[PDB]
Every structure is written in C-alpha cells, then in structure tokens.
Amino acid sequence: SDRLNAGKSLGAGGSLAEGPYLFIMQNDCNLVLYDNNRAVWASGTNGKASNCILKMQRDGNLVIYSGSRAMWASNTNRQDGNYYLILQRDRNVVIYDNSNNAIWASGTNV
C-alpha cells in the first residue's frame, strides 16, 4: 500500500511502496525512504533499539516504538482525528489531516 491510516502500524520490515519508492520500518529500527536502492531520508534511529514498530497515531504524530518506549516522533501533535501517512507519487512522504492539509512532510519531493 502507499498509505497508512491513523490507528495502524507497520511492524519490522513493514513498508509503504509506490513504484520504485520504498518507505520501510527496518529491523534495525531505522525508518528509511528508498529511491530504488538509494536511501534519501532516514529517521536516524538505526541501532537504537530492537523490534521497533511504526505507529501512525490518532493524534497525527508519527512515532517509532520499541516495546512501550518512543524512539522517535514527528512532533506534529494535534488532536484525535483521521490522519494518514502517504508515500506520494512525487516521492514526498506526507501526513495529511481530515481536510487534506499537510501537517508533516519528509521534504523528499523530486
């Protein structure tokens, strides 16, 4: 899938895909955007923890968890709503709110 809805998570090795673009929660706990084989964006949490999962929270925060501990957050807090994370056709990864306004972007658009 190209998108992750609020309330859902990606496990280790789980990913969003779009053509040759891959946005993946790695087993090494790094959250990475690949253009084919080239890493173009990363959370930078590689080696920080194990069995990390990515959670698109109902408050609009994208958060990496390892067990109950937060490893990394997008820090885009609003309130409970209907956000979604999307890997866009232009290679940007964006969190949208119920109104389709961008609240967070990776800034990796080509």
Is-contact 18 4, C-beta < 8 A? no
Place of tokens 């891959």: 22
Cβ-contact 13, 2 below 8 angstroms: no
Q: What is the resolution of this structure in A?
A: 2.0
Hey, where are the domains in the chain? Answer: 1-110
Experimental method used, please?
X-ray
Burial annotation 64-78 (CB, 10 A radius, 16+ → b, else e): bbbeeeebbebebee
Distances (CA, A) of 84 to 16, 42, 61, 67, 87: 12, 19, 10, 23, 10
How much is the CA Rg of the chain, to the nearest whole Å? Answer: 13
Integer distance in angstroms from the first to the last C-alpha of the chain?
Answer: 20
Of 3, 7, 1, the residue nearest 63 (C-alpha)? 7
What CATH number has the domain spanning 1-110? 2.90.10.10
